[PDB]
């Protein structure tokens, strides 16, 4: 990484994160760094343990994509930009063949 120190501290931290997941948390006193992961022993919540309210919301539009196109500064080239593009046949077999591309950098 290169951190342009002329940027703000808040924006620099926000840019260091979102590159590996990450979420700075100030709860319970300390600063805790948490990244996305899968566990074989998660905490079991039944709906009867809740307060009775429940809101389900799935925004498949504007958030579900079938293919990704990314770019990066690759030292294989003379530190120029290289594009990584690939599709998924299963995700396009689903969604009735709609063409939706995820753009990343």
């Amino acid at each position: 990484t290169i951190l342009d120190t002329s940027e703000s501290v808040f924006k620099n931290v926000q840019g260091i994160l979102e590159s590996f997941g990450g979420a700075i948390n100030n709860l319970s006193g300390e600063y805790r760094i948490t990244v996305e992961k899968y566990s074989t022993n998660p905490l079991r919540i039944n709906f009867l343990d809740t307060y009775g309210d429940l809101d389900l919301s799935d925004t498949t539009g504007r958030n579900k994509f079938n293919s990704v196109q990314a770019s990066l500064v690759d030292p294989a080239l003379s530190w120029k930009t290289n594009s990584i593009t690939f599709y998924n046949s299963k995700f396009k077999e689903q969604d009735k063949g709609l063409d939706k591309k995820l753009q990343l950098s």
């Binding site: 948390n25 100030n26 709860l27």
Partner: peptide
């Protein structure tokens, strides 16, 4: 109430 999201923000 102390609230914390997964996006960097002042608590």
């Amino acid at each position: 109430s102390h609230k914390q999201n997964r996006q960097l923000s002042i608590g």
